[PDB]
Design an enzyme around this catalytic site. Structure first.
Site, PDB file in Angstrom:
ATOM      1  CE  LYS A 117       3.226  20.874  -5.949  1.00  0.00           C
ATOM      2  NZ  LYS A 117       3.457  20.716  -4.469  1.00  0.00           N
ATOM      3  CD  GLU A 201       8.118  14.771  -5.310  1.00  0.00           C
ATOM      4  OE1 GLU A 201       7.738  14.900  -6.504  1.00  0.00           O
ATOM      5  OE2 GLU A 201       8.744  15.669  -4.701  1.00  0.00           O
ATOM      6  NE  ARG A 293       4.118  31.762  -8.226  1.00  0.00           N
ATOM      7  CZ  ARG A 293       5.084  31.897  -7.312  1.00  0.00           C
ATOM      8  NH1 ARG A 293       5.990  32.896  -7.336  1.00  0.00           N
ATOM      9  NH2 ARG A 293       5.170  30.989  -6.372  1.00  0.00           N
TER      10      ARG A 293
HETATM   11  N1  LIG Z   1      11.019  15.034  -3.262  1.00  0.00           N
HETATM   12  C1  LIG Z   1      11.439  15.885  -2.252  1.00  0.00           C
HETATM   13  N2  LIG Z   1      12.449  15.470  -1.434  1.00  0.00           N
HETATM   14  C2  LIG Z   1      12.818  16.351  -0.419  1.00  0.00           C
HETATM   15  N3  LIG Z   1      12.373  17.567  -0.095  1.00  0.00           N
HETATM   16  C3  LIG Z   1      11.361  17.960  -0.946  1.00  0.00           C
HETATM   17  C4  LIG Z   1      10.849  17.155  -2.051  1.00  0.00           C
HETATM   18  N4  LIG Z   1       9.815  17.819  -2.718  1.00  0.00           N
HETATM   19  C5  LIG Z   1       9.698  19.024  -2.047  1.00  0.00           C
HETATM   20  N5  LIG Z   1      10.621  19.133  -0.949  1.00  0.00           N
HETATM   21  C6  LIG Z   1      10.796  20.286  -0.021  1.00  0.00           C
HETATM   22  O1  LIG Z   1       9.494  20.889  -0.069  1.00  0.00           O
HETATM   23  C7  LIG Z   1       9.771  22.199  -0.344  1.00  0.00           C
HETATM   24  C8  LIG Z   1       8.777  22.802  -1.227  1.00  0.00           C
HETATM   25  O2  LIG Z   1       8.174  21.723  -2.060  1.00  0.00           O
HETATM   26  P1  LIG Z   1       7.282  22.337  -3.572  1.00  0.00           P
HETATM   27  O3  LIG Z   1       7.177  20.965  -4.203  1.00  0.00           O
HETATM   28  O4  LIG Z   1       8.204  23.328  -4.207  1.00  0.00           O
HETATM   29  O5  LIG Z   1       5.921  22.547  -2.847  1.00  0.00           O
HETATM   30  P2  LIG Z   1       5.348  24.282  -2.944  1.00  0.00           P
HETATM   31  O6  LIG Z   1       4.514  24.097  -4.219  1.00  0.00           O
HETATM   32  O7  LIG Z   1       4.576  24.398  -1.669  1.00  0.00           O
HETATM   33  O8  LIG Z   1       6.630  25.026  -3.255  1.00  0.00           O
HETATM   34  C9  LIG Z   1      10.965  22.239  -1.314  1.00  0.00           C
HETATM   35  O9  LIG Z   1      11.613  23.427  -1.366  1.00  0.00           O
HETATM   36  C10 LIG Z   1      11.850  21.220  -0.648  1.00  0.00           C
HETATM   37  O10 LIG Z   1      12.612  21.760   0.416  1.00  0.00           O
HETATM   38  N1  LIG Z   2      -0.343  28.297  -6.292  1.00  0.00           N
HETATM   39  C1  LIG Z   2      -0.579  29.345  -5.445  1.00  0.00           C
HETATM   40  N2  LIG Z   2      -1.870  29.816  -5.275  1.00  0.00           N
HETATM   41  C2  LIG Z   2      -1.981  30.875  -4.403  1.00  0.00           C
HETATM   42  N3  LIG Z   2      -1.030  31.529  -3.666  1.00  0.00           N
HETATM   43  C3  LIG Z   2       0.231  31.007  -3.903  1.00  0.00           C
HETATM   44  C4  LIG Z   2       0.500  29.923  -4.768  1.00  0.00           C
HETATM   45  N4  LIG Z   2       1.848  29.604  -4.792  1.00  0.00           N
HETATM   46  C5  LIG Z   2       2.401  30.485  -3.953  1.00  0.00           C
HETATM   47  N5  LIG Z   2       1.443  31.340  -3.370  1.00  0.00           N
HETATM   48  C6  LIG Z   2       1.700  32.414  -2.393  1.00  0.00           C
HETATM   49  O1  LIG Z   2       2.529  33.167  -3.154  1.00  0.00           O
HETATM   50  C7  LIG Z   2       3.271  33.891  -2.292  1.00  0.00           C
HETATM   51  C8  LIG Z   2       4.696  33.739  -2.412  1.00  0.00           C
HETATM   52  O2  LIG Z   2       5.140  32.382  -2.827  1.00  0.00           O
HETATM   53  P1  LIG Z   2       6.622  31.821  -1.886  1.00  0.00           P
HETATM   54  O3  LIG Z   2       6.403  30.324  -1.993  1.00  0.00           O
HETATM   55  O4  LIG Z   2       6.425  32.595  -0.625  1.00  0.00           O
HETATM   56  O5  LIG Z   2       7.848  32.370  -2.743  1.00  0.00           O
HETATM   57  P2  LIG Z   2       8.034  31.776  -4.334  1.00  0.00           P
HETATM   58  O6  LIG Z   2       7.906  33.057  -5.166  1.00  0.00           O
HETATM   59  O7  LIG Z   2       9.518  31.470  -4.063  1.00  0.00           O
HETATM   60  O8  LIG Z   2       7.147  30.572  -4.476  1.00  0.00           O
HETATM   61  C9  LIG Z   2       3.001  33.330  -0.817  1.00  0.00           C
HETATM   62  O9  LIG Z   2       2.074  34.175  -0.296  1.00  0.00           O
HETATM   63  C10 LIG Z   2       2.484  31.912  -1.169  1.00  0.00           C
HETATM   64  O10 LIG Z   2       1.593  31.438  -0.279  1.00  0.00           O
END
Ligand SMILES: Nc1ncnc2c1ncn2[C@@H]1O[C@H](COP(=O)(O)OP(=O)(O)O)[C@@H](O)[C@H]1O
Ligand SMILES: Nc1ncnc2c1ncn2[C@@H]1O[C@H](COP(=O)(O)OP(=O)(O)O)[C@@H](O)[C@H]1O
Ligand SMILES: Nc1ncnc2c1ncn2[C@@H]1O[C@H](COP(=O)(O)OP(=O)(O)O)[C@@H](O)[C@H]1O
Ligand SMILES: Nc1ncnc2c1ncn2[C@@H]1O[C@H](COP(=O)(O)OP(=O)(O)O)[C@@H](O)[C@H]1O
Ligand SMILES: [Mg+2]
Ligand SMILES: [Mg+2]
Lengths: 453, 453
Positions: A117, A201, A293
């Site tokens: 990330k 961040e 993806r």
């Molecule tokens: N810098 C940020 N400030 C506020 N909310 C955040 C920030 N980074 C992530 N989030 C919240 O965390 C949620 C998912 O974070 P993400 O970075 O997309 O982690 P994941 O890899 O689990 O999706 C985001 O959809 C948002 O709502």
């Molecule tokens: N980096 C990852 N490694 C393994 N499973 C993942 C990863 N990122 C997302 N997933 C799984 O992928 C599936 C869907 O991702 P979700 O965050 O639910 O919707 P998006 O497609 O919006 O990220 C969930 O089961 C989540 O836990």
């Protein structure tokens, strides 16, 4: 030119069925894989051939060497990984290439590059994309975090660098919360994603989650397909998604869409991917992560653009040129997607294990359903709680809301608790109808949890 | 012009669900009616309130006095009749008017006018519409039939002038067949429609069935929504419908469409209605009948135009103006509908009476499903055998065929025999894929009945 003769779908449930349908429409024979507990799964019945593999229900879909070998044995020329499981696993993608199997996705070096990330933020920065202020890489130690926090300014955010799905994200409002939550989230990552790597961040206040869809072919043609707003969330996981966003104007749509297109060309992106942004209260967008993806919520973008993303993934992987230019991409109307999850909102979204008994799927003008369920489908502890995705389209925002509400009110599922009654209340809610929702939406609207049975 | 607060749906099955959905999206409360044998019907669950009425299963839906009385008792302001049952019953439509209930349909005088095929042809003839040559009006006796037959020239067709749903129609290729068929089509029409009166027209060999959709408001603004090809038939009842036809060029579409509008305005038509034509080998259309109601196959037209016909029926009946001109009506792409009936095509399409066990509804990009079924749905002998309508849309004809084949191959229904395997074979048939089908299609392609069971 020539289409694959046979594709192996290395996934399950509703995304397996989605990919299998696109293959069938293209005339490609399909191969399913499944665990013994899913011998009656819908994707198994839809595929032309199906194989029971794995020593447990997750190993079925996570054992790269076994899946690649099965591809070779049965003559499958390509593998679609869906989302989750191995879809963003660079070793799986590279193993397919070494063995002569086409991975339907971006090149494995791009997966590797954007898989960390912190690194993907640095890449996007250099490419001209605004990013969320924070560490420029992994955190060496918690002393380094204590320093940088002071630099960025509280409140800051600890995030697993190898994370996903909402796991490994803890807020920090002072340096006392920071150190505690540092151990809290660290151990949580070594045990959850294999790497304890944490990044830091700025926490942006009252944020909205805005994401742009890109699609590119193997000849450098890249386009964007507009953006989605995915702000309504629980456990930092999406529940309701809309396209286009209500926040952005057509001119900002094209501007930010041009930036992500430019940056995707720079890293050599092809297939489908998505750049995720946070929008601050002023409405400025900062990049947070890239998913290399297909995403769960891809259907709302298909409904407003007319573009079949999954089918273009497969055609692109077979070497077809992308038959669109940006000027051809129009954004017609509005689409809403609701995740129907087998979990109980009034008990903190605790999973709802059990068996579907009554099951009636709505249909109608402007309604699409993505699902793999029937009476007798069992909800297990192993997999995501998603049962179905209900998707609607209308020409005006307010009609789209009314269409979604009326579709949800007719979606009958019994035997397990679901998110349906919660989602109906969201559709009825004045703020939602007015377009006012941040990522804190559920926290600030506790009355949507008031419903019967 | 205020929208109705409450609408009673005087029908069942998929069309009652279709209307109920349109009402919910408009914010209208709904009233269902049902027979004790269907107490678990889906339209009963979807409605806000439902009433068990009737002394047998058809009387539930055919007793005009009891239905209008119920609408008054519960405060329904309007009644939607669906299709079949009382939808083209002038007495029901007029009883509604006398009691102050709005009938969602055309004026009862136009229903009565166009309720006899012979009179309807004469009206269309005087309005400029080409008609099939034949008797000028009903036939006085068999002896008149022989005379007009020789005049028109064999082959000829006898038809019940009070006809619907394909009953009372007979091809006669010589005078020996005419005399036999007259008594048999007469007696069948008496038993079937209350009135034995027959007309005679030229039998058009190898015809296509081409039909134009009209929609008008109460203020004289009438448009057409293009045409549909409904040639694929059994027992003179449709099985597969497409829109637009492949036969007509855009210039013939607007020419024949202008003629139907003109004739619709002449008889003061409003609401939805359809004008059905037979097309000869040289490509020329002749009017054969008008249906003064919504038809089963209206969804294919909605998919290519974007016009929600049922919702517009309801708005028009409330006095809204039609928000379209003819110039706004575009015909985007291709749509196909297949009727999924509980019948066995290998045994003469005899109805298949039983209970649905396995049931899985397909969904995806470009797929719409109209259905009222779940595991345990009982097909009774009392009602039509329709289980579901599967509708697809694509930009190109070949993709629409591929999309429908693939949807059908994934639609699982066990417990009763259905048309699904036959429909799959039609989608795979080279002639169908090339556009080459007539109303004789099923008699001329015995191979589509070859499948394993
Ligand atoms: N810098 C940020 N400030 C506020 N909310 C955040 C920030 N980074 C992530 N989030 C919240 O965390 C949620 C998912 O974070 P993400 O970075 O997309 O982690 P994941 O890899 O689990 O999706 C985001 O959809 C948002 O709502
Ligand atoms: N980096 C990852 N490694 C393994 N499973 C993942 C990863 N990122 C997302 N997933 C799984 O992928 C599936 C869907 O991702 P979700 O965050 O639910 O919707 P998006 O497609 O919006 O990220 C969930 O089961 C989540 O836990
Ligand atoms: N003049 C004709 N020549 C050939 N086929 C005809 C003719 N009239 C009707 N048909 C066929 O019979 C079907 C039934 O015609 P219709 O008059 O529409 O009877 P119904 O009122 O039962 O629909 C039409 O769809 C068409 O296939
Ligand atoms: N004039 C009529 N009177 C009574 N029932 C009718 C009449 N016309 C059609 N039906 C019934 O209406 C229902 C559906 O009409 P069908 O002919 O099946 O498709 P369409 O809407 O194209 O006519 C069937 O049950 C058919 O028998
Ligand atoms: Mg994310
Ligand atoms: Mg007819």
């Amino acid at each position: 030119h020539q289409m694959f003769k046979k594709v192996l779908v290395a996934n399950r449930g509703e995304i397996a069925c989605r990919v299998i349908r696109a293959c069938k429409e293209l005339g490609i024979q399909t191969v399913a894989i499944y665990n013994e507990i899913e011998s009656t799964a819908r994707h198994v019945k839809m595929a032309d051939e199906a194989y029971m593999i794995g020593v447990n229900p997750l190993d079925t879909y996570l054992n790269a060497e076994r899946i690649v070998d099965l591809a070779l044995e049965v003559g499958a020329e390509a593998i679609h990984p869906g989302y989750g499981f191995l879809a963003e696993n660079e070793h799986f993608a590279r193993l397919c290439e070494e063995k002569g199997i086409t991975f339907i996705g971006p090149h494995w070096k791009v997966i590797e590059l954007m898989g960390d990330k912190a690194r993907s933020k640095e890449v996007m920065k250099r490419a001209g994309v605004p990013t969320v202020p924070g560490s420029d890489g992994i955190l060496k130690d918690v002393e380094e975090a204590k320093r940088i926090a002071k630099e960025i300014g509280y409140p800051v955010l600890l995030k697993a660098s190898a994370g996903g799905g909402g796991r490994g994200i803890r807020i920090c409002r002072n340096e006392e919360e920071l150190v505690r939550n540092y151990e809290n989230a660290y151990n949580e990552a070594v045990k959850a994603f294999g790497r304890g790597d944490l990044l830091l961040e700025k926490y942006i206040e009252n944020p909205k989650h805005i994401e742009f869809q890109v699609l590119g072919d193997k000849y450098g043609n890249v386009i964007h397909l507009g953006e989605r707003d995915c702000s309504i969330q629980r456990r930092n996981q999406k529940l309701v998604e809309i396209a286009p966003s209500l926040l952005l104007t057509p001119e900002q749509r094209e501007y930010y869409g041009s930036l992500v297109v430019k940056a995707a060309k720079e890293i050599g992106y092809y297939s489908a991917g998505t750049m995720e942004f946070i929008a601050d209260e002023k409405g400025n967008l900062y990049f947070i992560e890239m998913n290399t993806r297909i995403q769960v919520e891809h259907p709302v973008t298909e409904m407003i653009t007319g573009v079949d993303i999954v089918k273009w993934q497969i055609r692109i992987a077979a070497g077809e040129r992308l038959r669109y230019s940006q000027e051809d991409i129009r954004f017609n109307g509005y689409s809403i997607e609701c995740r129907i999850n087998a979990e109980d909102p009034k008990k903190g979204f605790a999973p709802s294990i059990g068996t579907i008994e009554r099951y009636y799927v709505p249909g109608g003008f402007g309604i699409r359903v993505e699902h793999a369920s029937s009476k007798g489908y069992e909800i297990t502890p192993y997999y995501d709680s998603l049962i179905a995705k209900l998707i609607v389209w209308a020409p005006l925002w307010e009609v789209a809301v009314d269409r979604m509400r009326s579709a949800l009110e007719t979606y009958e599922i019994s035997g397990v608790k679901t998110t349906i009654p919660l989602l109906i209340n969201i559709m009825k809610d004045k703020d939602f109808r007015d377009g006012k929702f941040t990522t804190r939406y559920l926290e600030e609207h506790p009355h949507v949890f008031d419903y019967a049975e």
